[PDB]
Amino acid sequence: KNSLALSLTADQMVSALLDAEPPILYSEYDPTRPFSEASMMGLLTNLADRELVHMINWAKRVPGFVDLTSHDQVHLLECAWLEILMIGLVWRSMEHPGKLLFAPNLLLDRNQGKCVEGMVEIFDMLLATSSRFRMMNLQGEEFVCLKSIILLNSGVYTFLSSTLKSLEEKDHIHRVLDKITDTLIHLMAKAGLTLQQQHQRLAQLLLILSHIRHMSNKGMEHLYSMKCKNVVPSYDLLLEMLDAHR
Amino acid sequence: RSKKNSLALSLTADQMVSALLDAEPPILYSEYDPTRPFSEASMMGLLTNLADRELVHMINWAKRVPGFVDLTSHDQVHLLECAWLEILMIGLVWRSMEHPGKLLFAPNLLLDRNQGKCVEGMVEIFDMLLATSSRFRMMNLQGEEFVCLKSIILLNSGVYTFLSSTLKSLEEKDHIHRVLDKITDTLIHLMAKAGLTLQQQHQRLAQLLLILSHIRHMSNKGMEHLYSMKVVPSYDLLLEMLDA
Ligand SMILES: CC/C(=C(/c1ccc(/C=C/C(=O)O)cc1)c1ccc2n[nH]cc2c1)c1ccc(F)cc1Cl
Ligand SMILES: CC/C(=C(/c1ccc(/C=C/C(=O)O)cc1)c1ccc2n[nH]cc2c1)c1ccc(F)cc1Cl
Ligand SMILES: [Cl-]
């Protein structure tokens, strides 16, 4: 692939990723009205709906992503969307121990998780991830690398791949993933970590992604258990949004 | 802030690998000569039976993973509850590597895709497992890398879901993270000795650890299908096997 992505240095990768970051959105409720009146699930659903649109724009700006066919872009987003929302939430919540910062005007604690049956389980997992990032002193530059890894990794092993084209798409993804790895290592070397510390930190970061997958899976199961499914993107919806984007 | 006294942390890379290779469970056989062809119910029976027998050996293996016995029984159980199906699955994928298009559950139970269709929804899981096996094959995964990955799953999968208020709980967690760091070093060591450059080492490490996310996903899907049909070994069972 002549992909410009593969010619990027670590610093250019980080710049591109920092520049692609979506805005922090606000929850939509009247702050003049008391907080009951508001449905918690309604607020969260609405927020996720609005976050999704921005996620598509962000994805299109991840180096290497637009080199893929639309079909593969959709497949990656279908698999990764909730993991991406979740890693964003955890990062925003880092400086708020015991709380989840859904939006600047929607900072929830554990006991607010108990609104909606089974959500507290997810809340606790999210809190623990936020604690882990805090403990590790996760940097914004590392965060954007991890979020891009999720986009590219989560769906890559579930392409139905008979064709030459599909094999080339997979190879491409793996090369970009290798570039993000290099980028992460670079950031750590420049922060003055030893070689051993670099590889240990890389491993600690990537192992957290396993827990993010777990949380996404649990979350998706609770959502599928519902008789309404207002925002969870079908392939076709995602393809439309990708086409509607351009 | 306190660092648990563990012989595990004094092991070199080479000693870690040896200890892990030595702890490997045996390859078990499926219930000998069943009625073939299989029904949906008979296939599930064979797979359930196999998992039950594999579990006992998994506990023995876990007890021999350096650092694992340093933990309290409660924490050992928590790790196994979270990791058990992922461990079965990574074992299966490794055994299946040299059998393209097939899953080697046991030497007398080698199934292909179309045999996955015998139980409703299972082919989806089969396909994910096959794809993982292909990925390991493509990467030329080595047996020494495999044992490191399998131990990482044991230690990592449940580590973030200890409910941890006390200093003691934080020290247990730190211990786990140090052992995980030791296994990372061990993996890097193996790659360096295989003659990979520094860049290649870090890239390969990342490729391997990213597969663990897919293994978590398969475990989750597997558990969901099983709950839809009917499964996590009970705390008490696990405790007994750990005590026994
Ligand atoms: C953990 C929080 C959460 C989010 C969520 C995602 C989708 C929907 C609804 C989809 C639909 O009807 O199609 C509802 C809530 C959430 C909503 C904003 C978010 N912004 N950043 C992260 C965020 C997560 C949630 C809550 C309950 C649950 F059973 C499962 C989940 Cl995942
Ligand atoms: C994919 C294969 C499979 C395994 C399996 C694991 C546990 C149980 C437990 C049931 C119970 O306790 O009542 C049943 C089946 C399997 C059985 C041996 C195995 N050895 N190595 C890997 C292995 C997997 C399976 C099948 C259908 C499904 F819906 C989900 C799964 Cl996970
Ligand atoms: Cl908005």
Side-chain angles (χ1 to χ4, degrees):
Chain A
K1 275 268 210 304
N2 301 343
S3 180
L4 273 282
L6 301 187
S7 75
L8 301 194
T9 64
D11 285 329
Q12 289 159 4
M13 179 67 78
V14 181
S15 294
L17 292 182
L18 285 174
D19 209 40
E21 270 307 89
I24 294 170
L25 302 185
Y26 278 77
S27 180
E28 270 192 288
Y29 62 83
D30 203 322
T32 64
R33 296 316 309 158
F35 206 68
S36 61
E37 297 215 358
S39 162
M40 191 70 71
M41 262 302 289
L43 289 186
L44 295 171
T45 303
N46 175 258
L47 183 64
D49 192 29
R50 281 182 293 120
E51 285 196 70
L52 186 54
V53 192
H54 290 287
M55 192 196 296
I56 276 67
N57 295 338
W58 159 83
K60 301 291 258 175
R61 301 179 60 182
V62 166
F65 192 80
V66 288
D67 301 333
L68 300 174
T69 62
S70 266
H71 171 290
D72 287 336
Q73 293 176 24
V74 170
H75 182 80
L76 292 180
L77 284 163
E78 181 169 21
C79 298
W81 72 274
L82 188 57
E83 286 185 82
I84 293 156
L85 286 184
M86 284 178 164
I87 198 179
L89 173 58
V90 155
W91 167 251
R92 297 200 293 278
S93 301
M94 256 178 87
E95 301 312 328
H96 298 91
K99 296 179 156 53
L100 295 180
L101 197 158
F102 287 96
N105 62 336
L106 191 63
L107 176 65
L108 306 179
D109 67 17
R110 250 191 120 276
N111 287 108
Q112 282 161 302
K114 298 173 185 206
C115 307
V116 18
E117 100 171 313
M119 195 165 75
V120 287
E121 171 214 48
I122 298 293
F123 263 52
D124 286 345
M125 295 188 289
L126 293 161
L127 291 172
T129 312
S130 211
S131 313
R132 180 59 180 158
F133 285 175
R134 207 180 326 108
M135 187 203 317
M136 287 184 77
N137 293 344
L138 183 69
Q139 303 298 298
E141 292 91 355
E142 296 171 312
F143 162 73
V144 301
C145 288
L146 291 178
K147 194 166 68 161
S148 296
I149 288 174
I150 290 181
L151 175 61
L152 295 168
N153 189 53
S154 291
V156 73
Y157 314 112
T158 58
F159 289 155
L160 159 267
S161 331
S162 165
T163 57
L164 192 263
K165 185 60 197 176
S166 188
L167 274 154
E168 132 181 357
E169 295 276 282
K170 268 188 289 179
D171 293 343
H172 181 68
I173 290 160
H174 291 304
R175 290 187 295 264
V176 179
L177 282 168
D178 280 352
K179 288 300 290 183
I180 300 166
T181 300
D182 298 339
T183 300
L184 280 161
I185 289 296
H186 180 256
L187 294 169
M188 295 169 198
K190 290 293 310 307
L193 281 60
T194 64
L195 276 288
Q196 198 190 39
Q197 291 173 324
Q198 285 166 40
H199 72 62
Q200 283 173 359
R201 191 178 173 80
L202 175 65
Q204 291 153 15
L205 291 178
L206 301 181
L207 289 182
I208 293 157
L209 302 198
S210 202
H211 185 62
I212 293 179
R213 185 75 79 109
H214 183 75
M215 294 189 290
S216 171
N217 292 157
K218 291 306 208 188
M220 208 89 84
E221 105 192 342
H222 289 60
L223 287 177
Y224 283 33
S225 94
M226 307 172 60
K227 254 170 281 134
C228 274
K229 178 207 160 220
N230 306 130
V231 309
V232 174
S234 68
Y235 181 96
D236 290 320
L237 171 53
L238 279 167
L239 189 54
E240 182 65 350
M241 292 177 83
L242 213 297
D243 210 14
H245 181 81
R246 55 83 144 181
Chain B
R1 178 267 309 243
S2 211
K3 180 185 181 290
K4 203 182 291 304
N5 195 358
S6 177
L7 275 289
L9 303 177
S10 76
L11 303 193
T12 64
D14 286 326
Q15 289 167 346
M16 183 63 68
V17 183
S18 296
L20 291 185
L21 285 174
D22 291 14
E24 271 302 280
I27 291 176
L28 300 189
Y29 280 79
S30 180
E31 268 178 300
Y32 196 76
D33 188 35
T35 300
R36 298 187 78 126
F38 302 108
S39 60
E40 171 155 40
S42 91
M43 194 153 67
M44 284 298 311
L46 288 183
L47 291 171
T48 303
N49 175 258
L50 182 64
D52 291 340
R53 280 183 294 119
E54 285 194 282
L55 189 54
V56 194
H57 294 287
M58 185 195 301
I59 276 66
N60 292 341
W61 159 81
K63 300 289 254 186
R64 299 179 61 181
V65 167
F68 193 79
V69 285
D70 300 334
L71 300 172
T72 62
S73 284
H74 179 69
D75 288 335
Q76 293 176 25
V77 172
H78 181 80
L79 292 180
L80 285 165
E81 282 180 334
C82 298
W84 72 279
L85 190 55
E86 287 186 85
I87 292 158
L88 286 182
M89 284 181 164
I90 196 178
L92 172 59
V93 157
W94 169 250
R95 297 200 292 279
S96 301
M97 256 182 82
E98 302 311 329
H99 296 91
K102 296 179 194 305
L103 295 178
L104 196 161
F105 288 94
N108 63 336
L109 192 61
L110 175 66
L111 308 176
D112 66 16
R113 205 197 174 274
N114 189 105
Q115 281 161 301
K117 298 206 204 63
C118 195
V119 357
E120 195 70 318
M122 193 178 295
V123 78
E124 315 180 64
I125 298 160
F126 266 50
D127 286 344
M128 297 190 286
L129 294 162
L130 290 171
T132 313
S133 211
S134 313
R135 176 62 179 157
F136 283 176
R137 207 169 41 252
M138 182 160 41
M139 288 183 74
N140 197 25
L141 182 70
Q142 303 298 300
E144 296 89 358
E145 296 171 307
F146 162 73
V147 300
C148 289
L149 292 178
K150 192 166 66 173
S151 298
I152 286 174
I153 289 178
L154 172 62
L155 296 168
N156 185 56
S157 290
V159 72
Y160 312 114
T161 59
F162 290 155
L163 283 69
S164 329
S165 174
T166 54
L167 199 82
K168 194 239 167 71
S169 71
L170 271 151
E171 296 162 358
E172 297 275 287
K173 269 189 286 188
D174 292 346
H175 179 69
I176 293 308
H177 290 303
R178 291 187 212 100
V179 178
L180 281 166
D181 280 351
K182 176 66 80 182
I183 300 168
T184 300
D185 299 337
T186 300
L187 279 161
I188 288 295
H189 180 76
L190 294 165
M191 293 172 198
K193 293 285 178 183
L196 280 59
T197 64
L198 280 79
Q199 195 193 11
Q200 290 173 326
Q201 285 167 43
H202 299 316
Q203 284 174 0
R204 189 176 177 77
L205 175 65
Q207 290 152 15
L208 292 178
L209 303 181
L210 290 181
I211 292 157
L212 303 188
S213 65
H214 184 63
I215 293 179
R216 184 74 136 267
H217 182 76
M218 291 191 292
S219 169
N220 286 336
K221 236 48 145 28
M223 213 93 78
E224 270 168 42
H225 288 56
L226 287 175
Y227 170 91
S228 95
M229 274 170 197
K230 279 32 160 60
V231 169
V232 172
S234 70
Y235 189 104
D236 289 78
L237 172 54
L238 289 175
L239 190 54
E240 279 297 357
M241 287 191 277
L242 286 164
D243 292 342

